[PDB]
Symmetry: C2
Subunit: 215 residues, 2 copies
Amino acid sequence: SSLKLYHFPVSGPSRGALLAARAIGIPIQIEIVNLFKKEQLQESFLKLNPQHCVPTLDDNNFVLWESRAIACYLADKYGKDDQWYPKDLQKRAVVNQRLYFDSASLYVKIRAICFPILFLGETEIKQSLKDDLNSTLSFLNQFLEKTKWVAADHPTIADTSIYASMSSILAVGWDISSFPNIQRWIKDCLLLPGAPENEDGARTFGDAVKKNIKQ
Amino acid sequence: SSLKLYHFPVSGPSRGALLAARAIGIPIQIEIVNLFKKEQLQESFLKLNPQHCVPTLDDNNFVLWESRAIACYLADKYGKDDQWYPKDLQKRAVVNQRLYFDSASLYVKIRAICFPILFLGETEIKQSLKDDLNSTLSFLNQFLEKTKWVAADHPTIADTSIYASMSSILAVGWDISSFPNIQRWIKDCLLLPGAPENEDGARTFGDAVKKNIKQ
């Protein structure tokens, strides 16, 4: 009956789903799933989903994966107001837009850099990949020129997801001096509910990446 | 006042946005934007959006990019029923989930193969990239084991987006013999409104990729 999140604190998308739960203020059971140690994986997790997808929400046997789907579902199902995911179709479209930007451009390009370094024997950040990510950062920097937060002048679930992504690469070490609007926004993100909890997982992600980079 | 889509028929995501407009049955002005020829780009397009983003919707001066945000916005704003994007939160979450799967896994991995071949001098499909895409196809093949369409036993905007993506790689030439459920579904996709229009753009995409592959 209790709402449950299967969560890997190292994962940006997993952290984005939890940040959304913190923001809307829902009590949630958190089952830690260590994806680094698959033979230690628990039966309660392996049972419910096609494959090892994290984050996974179990809301009273409705099983949902995909961090941003979770965020939108939680906001509409348990949100006590509209702020976090506005019901107005045009305001909602802008939040959805930033969410798809997170999923299709931002985290994709962070992952293109970090995944091969963590798992595939890569020891450096490729220049092409760096430029690709920086082009996406530039777009984010522009979003934040217009409004205080990514999708409005108030925080939304688009901020929790994009914060989870940005905190991941920033913990690896990224020079964002070219993007003063991101610099401003990332300090504002520290005020978000569950930000330290996010920062701790991001730091674990960051440390694991750095560890494999030959300086 | 008229609803307008800035569209590049070659682009999967652009085709996914148009397919959604066809599915919900909304009359739309279509401004063709040839991204292959930037110096020929029209003032009406360069004016309204931060950078050259396609697809871009102009709904009475509300300007929206991101194909899947467009699809959800069109479905809620102009949909004559619920079928295409159900209002039930759990059914909606599943469609959102498949949309994020399209944006974060499927089209991302098609693009990882095709973009460097089109633009960056790549002449072959890397084995690593092929395996990566095939792993995502396997997941899609499983979605389609449970239900006739990707997110339900009726078609949704998740099918229009994923069809736009799948038609793109299939036109390049991909062996999906290992995925009988995708094979079934892709024939059903031919029944979708605007499917030929999609197939024609996908074929142009496919031809441009093949042209650069050294066999």
